[PDB]
């Protein structure tokens, strides 16, 4: 069963712009393009969250159906974020698994006042350099 | 499984299912089905999305500066950017998970529309992504 990362690979092949299979340093125009796509998708999510917060400040009780535009824009952001990893030739699932393992290890840490999970004493970061080296050879 | 099961090798978890595991582990809200959020949850999700976006941008800028000055970039030089892009995935999935919205279901519908459009400009009979229908269907699962 395909992953969302593999879906992006299929999409790029379908638009005739097949992407490398292994990590590949990109030309500058590729980085600038991916940055623009990330910024526009981030701005759409940001605007929608501000929009929902303003409705709540007005006293409206949101329903689940009110969440459809935000869910759509969040998925569009996933699309362009996976898309950036795919055009770099970087297996997003392998990097994500490393990041996830180093996030589960934060469970014993304290929380910030806004709810952000913080790092416990002694915590050590994900080793994404090692994942990249793993993907680069085989 | 039952006494007849002689092997059990499940499909690996999706990245969306990983966010559910993380939020369970840290005691954060992770509803099974779509759930309107308190404003405090929306504010946190915004903060994490802004923070992760800023970190990605910082790493893209570092790469552009190094290659501008002639540096030969190896695959290993992409590791900070890849880490920050994975963090951005993480908090984007994380917002969908805290809303009780199956990110894989929503992504699959966005992908269906995007992949369909690539076979056309739109092909005949093209249907845009119907995320509203996905959330309704998730409510009745
Ligand atoms: O409340 C939290 C705190 C951290 N993270 C994940 C997202 C990133 O992968 C990474 C960011 O953590 P910091 O490095 O900013 O502390 O942890 C969350 O998803 N929710
Ligand atoms: Mn969009
Ligand atoms: Mn980060
Ligand atoms: Mn951070």
TrEMBL record, chain B:
Mn(2+) 1 binds at residues 51-52, 55. DUMP binds at residues 87, 114, 117, 122. Mn(2+) 2 binds at residues 51, 55. Mn(2+) 4 binds at residues 83, 87. Residues 116-127 are annotated as: Disordered. GO terms for molecular function: metal ion binding; nucleoside triphosphate diphosphatase activity. The keyword Metal-binding applies. This is HAD superfamily Cof-like phosphohydrolase. It comes from Deinococcus radiodurans (strain ATCC 13939 / DSM 20539 / JCM 16871 / CCUG 27074 / LMG 4051 / NBRC 15346 / NCIMB 9279 / VKM B-1422 / R1). The lineage of its organism: Bacteria, Thermotogati, Deinococcota, Deinococci, Deinococcales.
